[PDB]
């Protein structure tokens, strides 16, 4: 009967010289902290029960109290930064790392969960858990011939804790830690469980978010084909982190973007750029923007996959953030592409949505659209077709928009509109 205990009763039971009374009070505190409607985490912390739970973590001859205190500390460290800090101050990190090697599977899983929460608090606690040496037993827990023999929740919690170990920047995870975790991450990226796949993709996206050296560290393991395969999956919790990782990779060197292209990622984008989920569309358009900022052969590969009509459609009707990413994509396309590629972009119907988006209040998208229009005008000048494209701009009402932008607030906006009017509309 350890249900709905009072904090006073829990303190009275824990402070007793009875190990069984201590276990009963600890299970009561666990059931109290596992409740959904505002668990009194601060009330438990003020009572000074965290050191008692940390000490109970070490009672190897009493595994039930170990499991109960581990669950309680897990649910306490799952709260705010102050509560996780209070858990850490009690000396719980080395105790949980010691419990990682417990013969009882549930106690080891609880230690994994608690360490995952502590590392997910932030970068400082993540690096502190790494310094305490959790990576070695965490990876030893997965040194099995087939991951299918492990329990589902066990594998999921281990994958989530590993992902939290790769999470957060400023500072980024240590290079040695990332290199140690990466093979197990590549192995988890091929498991059949959807949650494990989603968390592994989240970890890969965390690792690829930063300098190109980290992106190369991830790419050298050859996970890009599997990343594209998971990008083609049907479960949105799997597609989202896969798309994030693909974008983070295409933010690097042109060789990494070419590695992404070689895996066949562009074939998935016809559905990604028309995904009913707004965030998926926005992230796909951002990835496309960074791909259009690459070499001319990469732009030609974008063209070959018929993604220019999809970019036009996203520019015409989508979320405003998706439309901003599309404008960035068109600007990168026109600035990096050949004159024939810009002519093809015009033939796909880019001028009408490019003009219709000039009525937005965001200044940055206005500058982006003006730069794109400028680049198309330079292409037409190289082709001697300035008059026809000027007629095109004037027919859809874009000339009126540029003339109204001539008297705009931002310096770049009005200087651009004036340049374009005086150079191609006189």
């Amino acid at each position: 009967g350890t249900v709905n205990w009072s904090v006073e009763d829990i303190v009275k039971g824990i402070n007793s010289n009875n190990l069984e009374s201590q276990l009963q009070a600890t299970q009561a505190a666990r059931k109290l902290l596992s409740r959904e409607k505002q668990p009194p985490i601060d009330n438990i912390i003020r009572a000074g029960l965290i050191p008692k739970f940390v000490s109970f973590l070490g009672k190897t001859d009493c595994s039930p109290i170990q499991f109960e205190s581990a669950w309680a500390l897990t649910n306490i460290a799952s709260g705010t930064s102050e509560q996780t800090k209070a858990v850490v101050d009690g000396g719980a990190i080395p105790a949980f790392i010691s419990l990682l090697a417990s013969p009882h599977a549930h106690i080891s899983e609880q230690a994994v969960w608690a360490l995952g929460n502590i590392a997910g608090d932030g970068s400082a606690f993540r690096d502190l858990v790494i310094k305490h040496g959790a990576i070695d037993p965490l990876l030893a827990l997965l040194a099995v011939p087939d991951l299918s023999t492990l329990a589902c929740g066990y594998l999921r919690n281990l994958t989530w804790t590993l992902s939290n170990l790769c999470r957060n920047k400023n500072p980024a995870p240590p290079l040695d830690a990332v290199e140690q975790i990466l093979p197990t991450l590549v192995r988890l990226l091929h498991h059949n469980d959807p949650e494990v796949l989603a968390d592994s993709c989240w970890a890969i996206s965390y690792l690829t978010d930063g300098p190109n050296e980290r992106i190369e560290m991830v790419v050298k393991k050859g996970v890009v084909p599997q990343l594209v395969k998971l990008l083609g999956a049907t479960e949105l919790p799997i597609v989202t982190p896969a798309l994030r990782a693909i974008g983070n990779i295409v933010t690097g060197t042109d060789e990494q973007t070419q590695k992404v292209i070689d895996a066949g990622a562009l074939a998935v984008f016809p559905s990604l750029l028309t995904n009913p989920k707004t965030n998926i569309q926005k992230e796909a358009t951002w990835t496309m923007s960074n791909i259009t900022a690459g070499r001319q052969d990469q732009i030609q590969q974008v063209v070959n996959h018929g993604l220019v009509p999809f970019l036009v459609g996203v520019l015409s009707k989508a979320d405003f953030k998706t439309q901003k990413e599309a404008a960035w994509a068109i600007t990168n396309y026109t600035s990096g592409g050949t004159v024939e590629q810009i002519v093809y972009l015009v033939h796909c119907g880019i001028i009408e949505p490019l003009m219709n988006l000039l009525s937005a209040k965001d200044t940055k998208i206005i500058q982006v659209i003006l730069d794109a229009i400028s680049n198309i005008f330079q292409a037409a000048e190289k082709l001697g077709e300035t008059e026809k494209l000027s007629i095109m701009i004037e027919e859809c009402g874009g000339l009126d928009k540029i003339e109204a932008l001539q008297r705009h607030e931002n310096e770049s906006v009005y200087k651009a509109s004036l340049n374009l009017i005086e150079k191609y509309f006189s």
Binding site: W71, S78, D121, W160, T251, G252, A293
Partner: peptide, 10 residues
């Protein structure tokens, strides 16, 4: 140019 947690056991 290119452009660039905690769970509770219930």
């Amino acid at each position: 140019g290119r452009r660039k947690a905690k769970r509770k056991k219930l």
